[PDB]
Amino acid sequence: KQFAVIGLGRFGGSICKELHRMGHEVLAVDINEEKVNAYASYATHAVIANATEENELLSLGIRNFEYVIVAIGANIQASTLTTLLLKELDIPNIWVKAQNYYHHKVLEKIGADRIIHPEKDMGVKIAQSLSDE
Amino acid sequence: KQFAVIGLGRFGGSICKELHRMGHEVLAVDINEEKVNAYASYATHAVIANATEENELLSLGIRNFEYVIVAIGANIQASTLTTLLLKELDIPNIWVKAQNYYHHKVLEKIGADRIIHPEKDMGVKIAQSLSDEN
Amino acid sequence: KQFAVIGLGRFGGSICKELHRMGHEVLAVDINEEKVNAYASYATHAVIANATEENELLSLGIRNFEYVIVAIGANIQASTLTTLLLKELDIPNIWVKAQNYYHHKVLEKIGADRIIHPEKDMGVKIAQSLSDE
Amino acid sequence: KQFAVIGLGRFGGSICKELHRMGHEVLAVDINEEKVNAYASYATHAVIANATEENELLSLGIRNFEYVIVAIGANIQASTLTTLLLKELDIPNIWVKAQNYYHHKVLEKIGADRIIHPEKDMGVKIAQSLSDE
Amino acid sequence: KQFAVIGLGRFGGSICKELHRMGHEVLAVDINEEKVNAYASYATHAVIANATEENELLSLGIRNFEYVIVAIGANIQASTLTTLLLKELDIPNIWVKAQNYYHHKVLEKIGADRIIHPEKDMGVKIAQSLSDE
Amino acid sequence: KQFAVIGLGRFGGSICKELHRMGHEVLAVDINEEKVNAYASYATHAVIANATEENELLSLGIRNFEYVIVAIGANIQASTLTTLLLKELDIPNIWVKAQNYYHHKVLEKIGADRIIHPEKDMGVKIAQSLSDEN
Amino acid sequence: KQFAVIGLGRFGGSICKELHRMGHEVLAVDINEEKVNAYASYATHAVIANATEENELLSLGIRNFEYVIVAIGANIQASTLTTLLLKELDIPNIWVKAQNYYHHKVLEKIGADRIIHPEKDMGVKIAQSLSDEN
Amino acid sequence: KQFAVIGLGRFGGSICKELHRMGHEVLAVDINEEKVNAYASYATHAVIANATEENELLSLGIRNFEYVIVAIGANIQASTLTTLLLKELDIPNIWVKAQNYYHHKVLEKIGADRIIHPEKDMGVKIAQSLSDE
Ligand SMILES: Nc1ncnc2c1ncn2[C@@H]1O[C@H](COP(=O)(O)OP(=O)(O)O)[C@@H](O)[C@H]1O
Ligand SMILES: Nc1ncnc2c1ncn2[C@@H]1O[C@H](COP(=O)(O)OP(=O)(O)O)[C@@H](O)[C@H]1O
Ligand SMILES: Nc1ncnc2c1ncn2[C@@H]1O[C@H](COP(=O)(O)OP(=O)(O)O)[C@@H](O)[C@H]1O
Ligand SMILES: Nc1ncnc2c1ncn2[C@@H]1O[C@H](COP(=O)(O)OP(=O)(O)O)[C@@H](O)[C@H]1O
Ligand SMILES: Nc1ncnc2c1ncn2[C@@H]1O[C@H](COP(=O)(O)OP(=O)(O)O)[C@@H](O)[C@H]1O
Ligand SMILES: Nc1ncnc2c1ncn2[C@@H]1O[C@H](COP(=O)(O)OP(=O)(O)O)[C@@H](O)[C@H]1O
Ligand SMILES: Nc1ncnc2c1ncn2[C@@H]1O[C@H](COP(=O)(O)OP(=O)(O)O)[C@@H](O)[C@H]1O
Ligand SMILES: Nc1ncnc2c1ncn2[C@@H]1O[C@H](COP(=O)(O)OP(=O)(O)O)[C@@H](O)[C@H]1O
């Protein structure tokens, strides 16, 4: 019921739209103003903020959210830095989207609860569908 | 048992590796020679060919394969052109990886059996996992 | 007499201006509002619409037009998608502007009556002019 | 019979291929080595040279050629500078490919015998074909 | 008394300041807003406009000015295009600042009354001062 | 008759060419070898040397030259360092080309006999020409 | 006890914080207002001023300070010009942070009591630590 | 006696020169060929290699070296990735140069034995020198 998604892109935006359809309260935060306006109606709360600043994260109230999904793409440093800040806020579950194998290793060692690799993870279940078909 | 994957990238390469682990015969075709060499051991047959040429597709024997997966990325025209050629070869099932919404619409109307959107489709099942995780 | 041009750019805009001079009824449709305003006086009907939506095409009345020219440039997917929709509307003649060799092949197989390659096609007639000169 | 084409791109390359088919001697000059290698078999003489340097132009023997076509694209300064050098070499006929309206005006005033606008010029003859059809 | 300077840079700004000290009416036009604000007090009229647009030049009233100095630097195309527009406005005297030898040749042939090369022209008078010293 | 120009660029090269035309002996020194070769015929003596090294300056014989012009551009530190070395060699007249206002202040306080600002100084005489023309 | 630091950056800011911890009176001057506000609590006196203007330096009272540290970075001309002004104010000890080898030479000849090269000087003591660590 | 320095820049190059003077065997590795040539005489072994590739690190023999100093600057990802690879090679002591506070935190959590901040660390000892003076 209490979910937060950081980064409204192809992967992050899809999570907000799907969660909103199921009837869940989702907080969407993104630096780009156009992304927040587009997903303003698809999220319970839409915020234009920078996730790499610890002062803004406290203003949003991320510590309240049990699940935080960091879906920042094409900016690996922002994704790595955001998750490191979230552990200081003792977030119980942090789900991070990885970009490559090296980024996957860094996120694992800095304390990411679950690492998502949308291109690689989709292949291993498309292949599973082929066997079942 | 008879699968063909076109385009050995992040999405296409993952399918070949996973299918090979399960014990399936997979044909891997890619224009780039480095990709084919890397996945030569992970595929039953690895071929360096261009999927946009109908003469090369007949040489491989794609008509034999019941399932063909077009995993070409960052080259939308090659992905669109390859699937159009495959329908001429009366391929029963063609699975195509889409890049954006506009590419999804084009593939649907040209006769793609199943369209895959790895970034968008993963989000709708990650969100499903969140609900099931309470 | 009944012509429709989709995409008011360097190639599409030149067709509307030349046809208007000859005294022909031309319908101009383009997503960009500035392009439609600029060519509003150079076309019998100017419409701000998206050619990739089949609902808007029926509103314009494209099925009435015998000749439809798809002059969309720099957006290959929009050009490919528009021509595929037009064949559903049983348009007799569809002329499409191609961007590269791969786009030329796709348009040919999806049922484009005539494919135009302005950069390549101009070279083969400039060269012809050199021989005649 | 004696033609020279400068810049082996979409427009320049099409002229060399078409002239070669008709059986004409064409000299192809381009800074990029890949372009010259690709069109080496499609031109009687292929040269890797920079057209903005007056010393290299004399080495090629451009003054011998009666017709010189400057098909440099995406580099307006190189196209403008090349044609200015050619007039010093008293080239009888110089055909230049223009990029926009402002480039068309500059080429006209610096002494270009014929200015070609492939995107705009193709539209005025596609529109003519529509009327004749 | 009636002077116009286009481009408020190191060379253009120095002309406005020196002319203002001598008691002359100078119109300063520049695209950058910071440059116009800095030289607003050093010019009789300061305008934020683009010199490459013929519509804006007529609004300023450049045709009234007998002397127009085009001091645009680091943007050779803007400098070349601006002077070509000014000749359409039948400006009696046009003084242009050149960037290199090739730019000097282009400006001379498009009808620049006087071409200024601040780096090169200063050397020929510093050397003259050495002989007189 | 005895002039030395350091830095063969747009400003430094113009001084050597103009002085050579008037019939003066000019020594041209520059780190770049292409610049020295280009201006070898336009100078009585052309030398490929670094002006920031005091050992090379003595080899050239700069102390003999009464007028030394430091026309180094785009390298403010080299221009500032060269003029500081020249004062140790008790050069009577040192003319330096400045790059900006801050560089003008530094050169003035380190003992530059005359500071030249080609972009700014040309404007104040172009403006003077406008007044005399009207 | 009487120290002045000019330029509140990575190097200048570290000096003010460390001196403040030890219990010393430090004057911090910087053109940027955000830097002065950030280090206002870490310095006894924080001033927003330009060090290249001799009128502002007298207002601060730099002549009173025995030690002045010029930690201006990325603006070599400001660093060079500031130290030249300080010698006119007969400052006993002037410590300057250098940017490169050429800037090091200029500062040495204009009368800098001690020149600091944080990147180079840290390497020669990290290497010393390696030898002592066996 | 057995030291390896990765990245021949202002900080890395100073370590190699100082260690070479003291009479120590230093291996210098850098992607840039000019840096390796300049420091070839100042290091016992100079190698042109990429530290982000685990295959090249084994070729050099980094596992033999007890002390490895990662002095990569202006490329934070290369510095972070290199140190992560070194821990797989069970390097006893790894000294890393940090760029900012956020990079300092990441290196600390991924297992850097000692983190060096040349700009910040020099200030705390210059200030110490002032008190002692
Ligand atoms: N520091 C940041 N804080 C919050 N959101 C960010 C930050 N940096 C980037 N983003 C957002 O993350 C999104 C990443 O999208 P993109 O790079 O297109 O790949 P994807 O859509 O797969 O995530 C961007 O839309 C951007 O707005
Ligand atoms: N015409 C083609 N025929 C076969 N394979 C192709 C063709 N064009 C591209 N490919 C392959 O498809 C792959 C696409 O990978 P990429 O663009 O990185 O995205 P992804 O890894 O998500 O597929 C490339 O590795 C390339 O080798
Ligand atoms: N989906 C669309 N529907 C209608 N018009 C479009 C669409 N997408 C782009 N266009 C128009 O097509 C034109 C293409 O112009 P451009 O890309 O500059 O190349 P060209 O001028 O050669 O056509 C654009 O001006 C744009 O307004
Ligand atoms: N200075 C030059 N001299 C000769 N050829 C050039 C020069 N600059 C660019 N070219 C060539 O001109 C060609 C222009 O092609 P491009 O910019 O793709 O547009 P187009 O194909 O329409 O000409 C390039 O392939 C380039 O190799
Ligand atoms: N299209 C334009 N119209 C008017 N002013 C322009 C235009 N383009 C550039 N300028 C101005 O011309 C000035 C050129 O300055 P710069 O490039 O620094 O060299 P300089 O100072 O020697 O002229 C810039 O400050 C810019 O504001
Ligand atoms: N340390 C040095 N000693 C001698 N000459 C130098 C030194 N550094 C640079 N130069 C020369 O000074 C010239 C400066 O030219 P440039 O930077 O193009 O501006 P300008 O042409 O206006 O002087 C360069 O051609 C360079 O060869
Ligand atoms: N003229 C000046 N007077 C005073 N302070 C200055 C002046 N110019 C720059 N500074 C300050 O010096 C600091 C230099 O910091 P920076 O360039 O980041 O490198 P570092 O942090 O290593 O010193 C800047 O924060 C700036 O505020
Ligand atoms: N992947 C890499 N492997 C090895 N060396 C690298 C790599 N990336 C950068 N370097 C080297 O590290 C050096 C960093 O220097 P620089 O960025 O100037 O800052 P500093 O001199 O303070 O280290 C560069 O000279 C570069 O050659």
Curated annotation (Swiss-Prot), chains A, C, D, E, H:
It is found in: Cell membrane. Disruption phenotype: Impaired potassium uptake. GO terms for cellular component: plasma membrane. One of its GO terms (biological process) is potassium ion transport. GO terms for molecular function: identical protein binding; monoatomic cation transmembrane transporter activity. The keyword Ion transport applies. Residues 1-116 form the RCK N-terminal domain. It is a peripheral membrane protein. NAD(+) binds at R10, D30, I31, N32, N50, A51, I72, G73, A74, K97, A98, Q99, H103, E119. Its main location: membrane. Keywords: Cell membrane, Ion transport, Membrane, NAD, Potassium, Potassium transport, Transport. Homodimer, tetramer (dimer of homodimer) and octamer (tetramer of homodimer). Part of the KtrAB complex formed by an octameric catalytic ring of KtrA and a membrane associated dimer of KtrB forming a potassium channel. Belongs to the KtrA potassium transport family. Catalytic subunit of the KtrAB potassium uptake transporter. The 2 major potassium transporter complexes KtrAB and KtrCD confer resistance to both suddenly imposed and prolonged osmotic stress. This is Ktr system potassium uptake protein A. It comes from Bacillus subtilis (strain 168).
From Swiss-Prot, chains B, F, G:
The keyword Membrane applies. It is found in: Cell membrane. The gene is ktrA. GO terms for molecular function: identical protein binding; monoatomic cation transmembrane transporter activity. It is a peripheral membrane protein. The keyword Plastid does not apply. Its main location: membrane. It comes from Bacillus subtilis (strain 168). Homodimer, tetramer (dimer of homodimer) and octamer (tetramer of homodimer). Part of the KtrAB complex formed by an octameric catalytic ring of KtrA and a membrane associated dimer of KtrB forming a potassium channel. Residues 1-116 form the RCK N-terminal domain. This is Ktr system potassium uptake protein A.
